[PDB]
Amino acid sequence: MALKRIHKELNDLARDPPAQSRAGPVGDDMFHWQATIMGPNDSPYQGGVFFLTIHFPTDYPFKPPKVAFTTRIYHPNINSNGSIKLDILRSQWSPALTISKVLLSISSLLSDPNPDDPLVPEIARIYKTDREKYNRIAREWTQKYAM
């Protein structure tokens, strides 16, 4: 069940590769993937390359994959352990979602943070009251950890 669905996703990724992310299994553990996401243009992450680890559950797609950044990133919805606060990875997961769609949602999160439901309150505070300070710090972390 889950294994065939994961294989199908990998094949569709190879047949129409996305313009701004790559993803695939680590060795021949089909349930353990690594992904790369480009920092979005017009965001403070622009020019950066961010690595993610993906663990699929054995009842996928009925439970969400576990997704975390391994590259350090300064963002109000991603913490120092790489955990991602994103509703489609939790209560709003649906079985029609795919890794391709998750990666697009994470790119959208980088472009447009959600400072009102944050994972890191201190960063959300800066994002809301001093946007250019947030931009400067996020850019500095991109230059240090993602390039």
Binding site: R5, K8, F62, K63, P95, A96
Partner: protein, 93 residues
């Protein structure tokens, strides 16, 4: 498209929900077991699994597709039966 949004394969025994969406019988059943009363595509409230999509099943009897692993041309109404038994599939899994 005759694909199921849940399993991503060609529909098998398609079922249509009240919100108009069509899934394999086993896919919408398993979806509702895991997240009750909810469409697995549009998240609309669903009071039941739905009804057999006999119109979709009829249309699939005259459609054909090449097997993703052995390239043989297979009728869509028989695609699940093919991938169950195709040696190129069995070989990979």
């Amino acid at each position: 498209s005759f694909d199921c949004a849940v399993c991503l394969e060609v529909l098998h025994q398609p079922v249509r929900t009240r919100c108009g969406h069509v899934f394999c019988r086993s896919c919408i059943a398993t979806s509702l077991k895991n997240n009750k009363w909810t469409c697995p595509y549009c998240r609309a409230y669903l009071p039941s699994e739905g009804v057999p999509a006999t119109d979709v099943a009829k249309r699939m009897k005259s459609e054909y597709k090449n097997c993703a692993e052995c390239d043989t041309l297979v009728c869509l109404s028989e695609m699940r039966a093919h991938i169950r038994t195709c040696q190129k599939y069995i070989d990979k899994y």
